[PDB]
Design an enzyme around this catalytic site. Structure first.
Site, mmCIF file in Angstrom:
data_model
loop_
_atom_site.group_PDB
_atom_site.id
_atom_site.type_symbol
_atom_site.label_atom_id
_atom_site.label_comp_id
_atom_site.label_asym_id
_atom_site.label_seq_id
_atom_site.Cartn_x
_atom_site.Cartn_y
_atom_site.Cartn_z
ATOM 1 N N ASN A 1 0.791 -1.234 0.000
ATOM 2 C CA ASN A 1 0.000 0.000 0.000
ATOM 3 C C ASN A 1 0.815 1.273 0.000
ATOM 4 O O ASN A 1 1.707 1.435 0.835
ATOM 5 C CB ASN A 1 -1.061 0.031 1.100
ATOM 6 C CG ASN A 1 -2.054 1.187 0.977
ATOM 7 O OD1 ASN A 1 -1.735 2.347 1.247
ATOM 8 N ND2 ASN A 1 -3.264 0.883 0.567
ATOM 9 N N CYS B 1 2.676 7.758 -2.363
ATOM 10 C CA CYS B 1 2.010 8.451 -3.457
ATOM 11 C C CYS B 1 2.074 7.697 -4.788
ATOM 12 O O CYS B 1 1.622 6.555 -4.879
ATOM 13 C CB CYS B 1 2.380 9.934 -3.558
ATOM 14 S SG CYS B 1 2.011 10.913 -2.099
ATOM 15 N N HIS C 1 -5.625 9.145 -4.322
ATOM 16 C CA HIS C 1 -5.229 7.770 -4.578
ATOM 17 C C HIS C 1 -4.588 7.651 -5.947
ATOM 18 O O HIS C 1 -5.063 8.264 -6.909
ATOM 19 C CB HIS C 1 -6.415 6.840 -4.368
ATOM 20 C CG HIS C 1 -6.078 5.376 -4.388
ATOM 21 N ND1 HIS C 1 -5.242 4.785 -3.435
ATOM 22 C CD2 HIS C 1 -6.467 4.340 -5.259
ATOM 23 C CE1 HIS C 1 -5.151 3.520 -3.733
ATOM 24 N NE2 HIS C 1 -5.845 3.187 -4.784
ATOM 25 N N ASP D 1 -3.341 -1.461 -8.620
ATOM 26 C CA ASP D 1 -3.843 -0.682 -7.504
ATOM 27 C C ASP D 1 -3.109 -1.180 -6.273
ATOM 28 O O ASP D 1 -3.656 -1.930 -5.456
ATOM 29 C CB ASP D 1 -5.372 -0.875 -7.409
ATOM 30 C CG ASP D 1 -6.094 0.069 -6.456
ATOM 31 O OD1 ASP D 1 -5.442 0.643 -5.561
ATOM 32 O OD2 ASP D 1 -7.323 0.251 -6.601
#
Ligand SMILES: O=C1CCC(=O)N1Cc1cc2nccc(-c3cc(Cl)cc4c3N(C3CNC3)CCC4)c2s1
Length: 335
Positions: free
Chosen positions: A10, A15, A256, A273
């Site tokens: 994550n 960023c 995100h 992702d």
């Protein structure tokens, strides 16, 4: 890993880094050269070359999400602030200049400029006096203006547009005084791998603030760029295939980041992702990132003539035994 591809841990404060790492990882020729770097004597936490080797190695071998802690540590960007105050091409220059330095004197010297560097000429031409200034520049990336533009083509049109230096914006031509002049940019070469950042932020003089542009901005799957070269080659037209789309959703203080890639250059896309990689439609990768709160800010294109070299197959055998041994010991140290 049912796409065949593994994710990164994550993003948190990091960023757009994860987005860039998958982009560089799937620049296969770059990855192969990164593995050939002689890191044997480097420190396991402070060498950026080695930490990038390790991330690439783990992206190639791990079935679990890959961490970036040692990598962030290695170049000293360990805060949301360090990422927020910089743009993606500055992070890319950090990584790629570290890597190209380490390749000096090796069989893979010149990899970075081979893949990513092109050549341009800036000029100023006085109209009424015989004065011209020319500046040849190398570039590793292009920043395209989007406000008011419908597509990549119009950004390129704008990029090479000739400006008049007249009125209050006279050119200072030295001994000739203030002089009326034109200035333009022309591309002389385009690289194998073309990194385009879209100017989603600008200072605007009428409002007196830096504005975000959330307008629609369309980019093709196939980008022909022969129009913009000073001399085209008939043996090698500047036709480009979209490889990657780096996207931001949401708040300008966080938000995100995701990247869409078609790694093999074949039009079969995944959304990356962080830790979740998933197959996606082409429409999700391209059209649904046109905008007009989810903004593409970076596009990677690969030249058609270079596509099979840039995206050449990498196998586990293409990582040197020295480095595998090092990285395996450096994984045994983690247990
Ligand atoms: O717009 C400009 C001005 C100068 C330039 O090169 N560009 C292009 C960009 C490169 C870049 N590199 C990394 C992240 C972004 C970025 C994209 C969006 Cl749509 C939203 C937010 C971004 N950051 C940015 C990281 N710095 C702000 C966070 C805020 C939300 C951008 S935008």
């Amino acid at each position: 890993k049912h796409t065949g591809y593994v994710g990164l841990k994550n993003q948190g404060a990091t960023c757009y880094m994860n987005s860039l790492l998958q982009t560089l990882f799937f620049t296969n020729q770059l990855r192969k050269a990164v593995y050939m770097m002689p890191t044997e004597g480097d420190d396991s936490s402070k060498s950026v070359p080695l930490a990038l080797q390790r991330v690439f190695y783990e992206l190639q071998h791990s079935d679990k999400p890959v961490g970036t802690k040692k990598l962030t540590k290695s170049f000293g960007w360990e805060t949301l602030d360090s990422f927020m105050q910089h743009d993606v091409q500055e992070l890319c220059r950090v990584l790629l200049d570290n890597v190209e330095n380490k390749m000096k004197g090796t069989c893979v010297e010149g990899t970075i400029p081979k893949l990513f560097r092109g050549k341009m000429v800036s000029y100023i031409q006085c109209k009424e006096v015989d004065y011209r200034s020319d500046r040849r520049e190398d570039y590793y990336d292009i920043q395209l203006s989007i406000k008011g533009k419908k597509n990549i083509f119009e950004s390129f049109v704008d990029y090479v547009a000739v400006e008049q230096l007249d009125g209050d914006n006279k050119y200072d031509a030295g001994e000739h005084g203030l002089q009326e002049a034109e200035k333009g940019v022309k591309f002389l070469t385009l690289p194998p791998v073309l990194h385009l950042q879209l100017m989603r932020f600008m200072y605007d003089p009428q409002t007196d603030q830096n504005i975000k542009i959330n307008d629609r901005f369309e980019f093709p799957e196939q980008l022909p760029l022969d129009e913009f070269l000073q001399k085209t080659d008939p043996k090698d037209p500047a036709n480009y295939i979209l490889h990657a789309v780096l996207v931001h959703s949401g708040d300008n203080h966080g938000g995100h980041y995701v990247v869409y890639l078609n790694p093999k250059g074949d039009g079969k896309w995944c959304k990356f992702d962080d830790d979740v990689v998933s197959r996606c439609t082409k429409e999700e990768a391209i059209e649904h990132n046109y905008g007009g709160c989810t903004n593409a800010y970076m596009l990677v294109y690969i030249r058609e003539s270079k596509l099979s070299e840039v995206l050449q197959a990498v196998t586990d055998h293409d990582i040197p035994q020295q480095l595998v041994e090092r990285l395996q010991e450096e994984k045994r140290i983690e247990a």
